[PDB]
């Protein structure tokens, strides 16, 4: 007799447990979230390369990974509308098959983090945090509730930001929570204090390849804001989508650079159509980093 | 493994003695007990390349030749391998040419590292770090601590202390900072203005660190430029035109490129606003007000922007 | 050390009699002002001259002195724009050094005497006068008592008679909320002590102010806490008259109105600190008033 649904199930085709524990370990290093124990079971309906992620016994995401062969950025497959090329282990003499599966799996987990990381997961994290920083925890609890801390942490993970440096997140909250009430704008302040980390994960050889917005498109989104939620015309949406599709199909790795006030609203307009792209504001850009503009939409 | 390591110093492919000397001197010069620094080696890095990592993220890169000296001369025929930190060029001379000021290699690395730590003090010094400092201070001054806690919270005391260190002001003389807070916190309820009151009471210390042989090399501001920044205040935020910004940047660059160490003397009401206009462009120039300059100190004006 | 050394005295690189001198200075400061000074650190420097002495408050340079311990003064040196002459073996070498050092300590009394120093003083006071202490704490905070005591010391007034200071506070604190105005009331109750230190053979040498200059300072009082701001013309007229009296053997005290005495001191303190500002409410009876000049 059961009581509740099993949180994580990795469906495979008809050493494996070592991989599951390696993913659980790396996700804690990369994002600072203690993942639940993943259940492994074989299915006859699946293909030799097919891997299906199940969150609360419901299908969440499908994966195509060839464990006996390495891959580069010839067999081709796509994840988040981005094509990946797979080649044999002999032609390499580049990212490993196990490391690429983790990258695809981690993104799917962050997209459905609301089912994995919650208020109870935040409390257990804050209980351990109390042992080293109890007075910092007291100043935070004075203005924001456990639900508010859980919401801020979940919103950061949804846009690929590590909560491992909770001390810096709590320090930002303890400073801005007596000033701001809105959680969405409170997350933006936490992002500003994490500008050095944000730049580090999106920079390659010191430079950041950005795709900025034109004065017209920037002002069109600014007016689309209504009292909290964004609503823009199909003409502005098509001009933005076509430009992003032109860069994604060309296989260009980039980050969208927009204004501070519209950053949260721009993300909502692309969230469903484009998932792999990250939206960063000017306030989240740190010095000593070379800003390279690729295209102005 | 649940926590991110606070400090990592990556070196080239006795060392612990240097790390502890930095930790000791930082507490003497600023009154902040630094976390234990981790020593690591890398084949990717050069011989002189030293990179500082705050919470496993790259913070600052340094170029120090531990088998040489420093001087702020070279045209008379000396093998000089010059480098730069905070847009200020530093000349490296061999220990053989010393016998002819002179700065040590490990002392230069400390001066460069200590500046980088104060620029990222929000990740090293916080509310928990101040509470531990105030609890030790309680054994000495319990009633002084009570009068301060009557008006300002642990977060506000942490904010004041962080804002002072961010402009190279030591928190070792906490008694004077607390005495200044206990007097002004019942009157002023704004952190940025409260820090300015603590700065004015620390005028003797500020002047002592920026003066050479009882003389402060200041760079004044003209009536027009001073008035232009005054109207830049909207709410609190500062916003000025590109023309006024270029006039201030060109004159500062002219005095920075040409070997000249100075301080910027401005009005009390715009001191905090002038700092925000230059800190992102230039980080080695200190902003001082007329209330912060103590008597019996020779004021030497170099330029008026 | 976690905390900076409160007092350091650097001397010439030349006996253990120096420790006797430090303790004599510490004892006399409590007799003259009633403040228990922190233990002064004795150090020697090869950079300093045979006559040079440097005072350090919180490991920062505060004041420099020129004293000849083998001579007697009445070679020439100057302190606070006032000149003095030394001669071979009237004022003693250690007694004149104390006068110069004690003045420098009162100019930086905020870094030596604070809330905790006031609390330790009030705790000893509680053992003798507990009900008088209770009436003061009913209206005045520890910070305000510490501030009142600091304002008096900065104007060369002893806090030894804490009873009379507390008695004055208990009477005026339920009436007045301004700390600056509260100190003015303490000075009025200390009128007998003030006159006793500024008078020689029962005569007070005063330098009064003209109706015009008195009204000029009265007009310069702004509500921007209140601050004083007057024109350069009135400032130069006041400075030139004070300078003329100083470049001449003149020992005087400035006598002005009660309403402006706190603002008149502010305009002088920035330039000259040796000259004292006293109000008409502070001059005690049976004391001869000698008007030297009217600015």
Swiss-Prot record, chain A:
Domain of life where this protein originates: Bacteria
Location within or outside the cell: Cell inner membrane
Signal peptide as annotated in the record: none
Purpose of the protein: Necessary for the secretion of IPA invasins.
Family indicated by similarity: Belongs to the FHIPEP (flagella/HR/invasion proteins export pore) family.
Entry protein name: Protein MxiA
